[PDB]
Amino acid sequence: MLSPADKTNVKAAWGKVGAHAGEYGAEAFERMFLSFPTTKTYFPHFDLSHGSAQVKGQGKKVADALTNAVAHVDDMPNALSALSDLHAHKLRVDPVNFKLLSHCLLVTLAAHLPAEFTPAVHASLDKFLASVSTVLTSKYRGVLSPADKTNVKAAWGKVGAHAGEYGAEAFERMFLSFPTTKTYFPHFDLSHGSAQVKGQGKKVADALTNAVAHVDDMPNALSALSDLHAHKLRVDPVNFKLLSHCLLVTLAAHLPAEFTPAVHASLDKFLASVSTVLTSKYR
Amino acid sequence: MHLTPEEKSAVTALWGKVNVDEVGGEALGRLLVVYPWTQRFFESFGDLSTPDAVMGNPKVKAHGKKVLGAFSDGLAHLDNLKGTFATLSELHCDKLHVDPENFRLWGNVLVCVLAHHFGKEFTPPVQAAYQKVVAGVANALAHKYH
Amino acid sequence: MHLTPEEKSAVTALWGKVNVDEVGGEALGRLLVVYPWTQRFFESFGDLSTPDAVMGNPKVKAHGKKVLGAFSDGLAHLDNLKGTFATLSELHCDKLHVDPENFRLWGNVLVCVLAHHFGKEFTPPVQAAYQKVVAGVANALAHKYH
Ligand code: HEM
Ligand code: HEM
Ligand code: HEM
Ligand code: HEM
């Protein structure tokens, strides 16, 4: 979330960018294609050689769009509306790639703005490009529809008194599948059957039950949990995706009749929204 | 790919029960439903507008079976996934232009489908071994990308 | 880790111009500023209240230099990063409990720091070579996690 001082820092740097934004945009794509060659799969129709008119034009278009976003930083979803539609329905770039371009744009700005690229401005620019990325990927699936909310309530209703037991199973599945997540629990017994893991699973399932109950008001209902994870526990955001998968696996294994493709899709969306809320105060 | 005896045993035992036709189409269909941007590679497959259209789309079912068929063969050569998938790796990069991140999403959907189909028999240690394998296969398919 | 001779030379040439102490301190400070959740390991380092407090903290600077000194010595072992970093991998997992995701964040912040330090000299091909090296170093530090 862009603080007012964040907005000040971005406007500062981007002004300095000034008339070179298009050149810088092209350089960032060229850096991306070279450092992260999987990104070239989205441009097989381009001459991707150095200095190519197609790559230059791409950079200027992308630069103009970021200029638009800087100039409308307090209403980005609306300023970028057309662009969110096009990437969501037509281009369909996998979201992970936005992080790769954002890193190469940061690198480009660093290499060109020696005086301005201070630690605080770097932090602000990083947050700004993550917000842009978030807005551009926001319609790929589009936040919770009334059908999504119905599906979630129906499935979570069937979980019911088993909520805690499925939360403990989800953690155990996560620890065995993705051993790096164990680094957050060095003080627990992680063996199968562990009461500490059972207790953790219960707390998490209980919070989720609270989220389904307040599905139209999740940021307030989880505000204290958002604070806890961001300033105390400080779990790296990538791990929320790993637990969400393991929760989905757990539900599938216990709910053979209810876990339809449509319900699977709505649950994945719901857990991603929960994850978003829990990491929203990190920076 | 190195698996422990315990892990390789779990993988092979469960795989003998898998109907490659049914599971394969299920996994590709759910990928297209849950992550709809993956539909960008299948424009010529017909109607994929609703979960029901997707799941019952026969071209989806046919392609799904083919994909899982090639995965199945890879289970035979767990010691050399790279060499086994080299030609398909080059294919997916040079001709099909598929972002390797899709292989990871497909792997995770497959694990979801296995849990759904097998229930309590798909235990935590069994999932863990399958997660290793799908990660191995995805890295193998991404190996020849340039 | 496999780099071409060209890339190796590109990495080595630039590194000869680096002041390990200054760059090391700057990269750790920027990591703690830009991704503040990474501060979770350094509550004994004292004042981390603001970007300026972070960047001028002597304990931050000292740890930064230590980290980059180990990085630096790894650059002389690009063909055996895993064996070179094996014991440090076990240390960060069993005793320090550091999520390997932090190593990737650290690697990206170091690349920004080099670009800031060296400007136009930090060309796209030179960047590409460092991106492989910090990825390779991160994988090697994560190798012994269990
Ligand atoms: C900050 C992130 C991004 C912004 C602001 C952005 C913006 C744009 C804009 C303004 C256009 C042109 C729209 C038009 O002319 O109708 C475009 C096109 C495109 N973008 Fe994005 N983009 C971003 C990230 C990405 C990423 C990460 C990729 C892929 C790795 C990507 C791939 C494409 C493709 C394939 C095109 C079409 C090029 C053509 O064939 O003309 N974009 N983008
Ligand atoms: C759906 C995602 C999550 C939710 C809703 C959630 C919720 C919670 C809840 C309810 C607590 C207990 C707070 C209290 O003591 O009152 C908690 C604590 C904790 N969470 Fe999260 N959590 C989530 C994801 C994660 C992830 C992915 C990790 C790390 C892999 C994690 C690690 C922790 C840790 C380390 C604790 C404290 C354990 C203890 O000392 O008792 N959380 N979480
Ligand atoms: C473990 C995962 C996968 C394996 C082993 C696999 C295997 C294959 C095989 C054996 C073919 C046939 C090539 C030929 O007929 O010459 C193929 C084609 C194809 N694959 Fe992959 N695939 C996998 C994942 C994916 C994913 C995730 C996508 C995209 C979301 C994808 C998209 C395609 C496309 C578009 C074709 C061509 C179909 C056509 O002819 O219309 N593949 N794949
Ligand atoms: C490529 C990156 C890194 C390398 C090469 C590296 C290397 C080292 C070295 C050489 C030590 C000293 C071990 C000893 O006492 O013998 C160390 C300790 C430590 N590192 Fe890492 N490290 C890296 C990244 C990180 C990151 C990103 C974090 C956490 C955000 C971290 C946290 C720590 C901590 C907390 C210690 C212990 C310091 C103390 O006890 O005073 N390391 N690291």
mmCIF file of C-alpha atoms and ligand atoms in Angstrom, chain B residues 28 31 38 41-42 44-45 63 66-67 70-71 85 88 91-92 96 98 102-103 106 137 141, ligand 3:
data_model
loop_
_atom_site.group_PDB
_atom_site.id
_atom_site.type_symbol
_atom_site.label_atom_id
_atom_site.label_comp_id
_atom_site.label_asym_id
_atom_site.label_seq_id
_atom_site.Cartn_x
_atom_site.Cartn_y
_atom_site.Cartn_z
ATOM 1 C CA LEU B 28 -5.771 -30.577 -17.731
ATOM 2 C CA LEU B 31 -5.883 -26.328 -14.922
ATOM 3 C CA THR B 38 -3.521 -21.088 -19.335
ATOM 4 C CA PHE B 41 -2.382 -22.165 -25.637
ATOM 5 C CA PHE B 42 -5.570 -23.977 -26.574
ATOM 6 C CA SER B 44 -8.296 -24.175 -31.270
ATOM 7 C CA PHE B 45 -9.850 -26.629 -28.762
ATOM 8 C CA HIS B 63 -4.725 -33.691 -24.879
ATOM 9 C CA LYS B 66 -1.395 -37.444 -23.978
ATOM 10 C CA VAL B 67 0.294 -35.160 -21.488
ATOM 11 C CA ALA B 70 4.315 -38.700 -21.393
ATOM 12 C CA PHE B 71 4.522 -38.027 -17.664
ATOM 13 C CA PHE B 85 12.398 -34.983 -21.516
ATOM 14 C CA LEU B 88 9.904 -32.418 -25.425
ATOM 15 C CA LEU B 91 9.549 -28.665 -28.453
ATOM 16 C CA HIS B 92 7.777 -26.704 -25.757
ATOM 17 C CA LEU B 96 5.012 -24.098 -28.738
ATOM 18 C CA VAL B 98 5.029 -22.332 -23.493
ATOM 19 C CA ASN B 102 2.686 -23.599 -16.591
ATOM 20 C CA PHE B 103 4.419 -26.917 -15.849
ATOM 21 C CA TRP B 106 -0.051 -28.309 -13.892
ATOM 22 C CA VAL B 137 9.459 -33.147 -14.246
ATOM 23 C CA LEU B 141 10.776 -29.783 -19.204
HETATM 24 C C1 HEM D 3 4.332 -32.546 -17.388
HETATM 25 C C2 HEM D 3 3.697 -31.652 -18.318
HETATM 26 C C3 HEM D 3 3.654 -31.896 -19.717
HETATM 27 C C4 HEM D 3 4.068 -32.887 -20.557
HETATM 28 C C5 HEM D 3 4.857 -34.146 -20.213
HETATM 29 C C6 HEM D 3 3.624 -32.526 -21.885
HETATM 30 C C7 HEM D 3 3.745 -33.321 -23.002
HETATM 31 C C8 HEM D 3 3.311 -33.002 -24.268
HETATM 32 C C9 HEM D 3 3.350 -33.906 -25.400
HETATM 33 C C10 HEM D 3 3.819 -35.353 -25.343
HETATM 34 C C11 HEM D 3 2.884 -33.209 -26.470
HETATM 35 C C12 HEM D 3 2.769 -33.664 -27.923
HETATM 36 C C13 HEM D 3 3.761 -33.104 -28.943
HETATM 37 C C14 HEM D 3 3.619 -33.648 -30.354
HETATM 38 O O1 HEM D 3 2.514 -34.158 -30.649
HETATM 39 O O2 HEM D 3 4.624 -33.543 -31.099
HETATM 40 C C15 HEM D 3 2.511 -31.898 -25.982
HETATM 41 C C16 HEM D 3 1.964 -30.901 -26.752
HETATM 42 C C17 HEM D 3 1.481 -29.699 -26.291
HETATM 43 N N1 HEM D 3 1.617 -29.241 -24.999
HETATM 44 FE FE1 HEM D 3 2.668 -30.107 -23.502
HETATM 45 N N2 HEM D 3 3.050 -31.270 -21.884
HETATM 46 C C18 HEM D 3 3.033 -30.889 -20.565
HETATM 47 C C19 HEM D 3 2.533 -29.697 -20.099
HETATM 48 C C20 HEM D 3 1.965 -28.711 -20.868
HETATM 49 C C21 HEM D 3 1.323 -27.532 -20.329
HETATM 50 C C22 HEM D 3 1.176 -27.231 -18.842
HETATM 51 C C23 HEM D 3 0.902 -26.793 -21.396
HETATM 52 C C24 HEM D 3 0.305 -25.509 -21.545
HETATM 53 C C25 HEM D 3 -0.581 -24.996 -20.514
HETATM 54 C C26 HEM D 3 1.176 -27.597 -22.574
HETATM 55 C C27 HEM D 3 0.754 -27.276 -23.843
HETATM 56 C C28 HEM D 3 0.950 -28.036 -24.971
HETATM 57 C C29 HEM D 3 0.480 -27.682 -26.295
HETATM 58 C C30 HEM D 3 -0.190 -26.363 -26.661
HETATM 59 C C31 HEM D 3 0.737 -28.750 -27.094
HETATM 60 C C32 HEM D 3 0.303 -28.992 -28.534
HETATM 61 C C33 HEM D 3 -1.124 -29.486 -28.786
HETATM 62 C C34 HEM D 3 -1.601 -29.335 -30.222
HETATM 63 O O3 HEM D 3 -0.989 -30.011 -31.082
HETATM 64 O O4 HEM D 3 -2.550 -28.541 -30.410
HETATM 65 N N3 HEM D 3 1.912 -28.713 -22.245
HETATM 66 N N4 HEM D 3 2.761 -31.794 -24.632
#
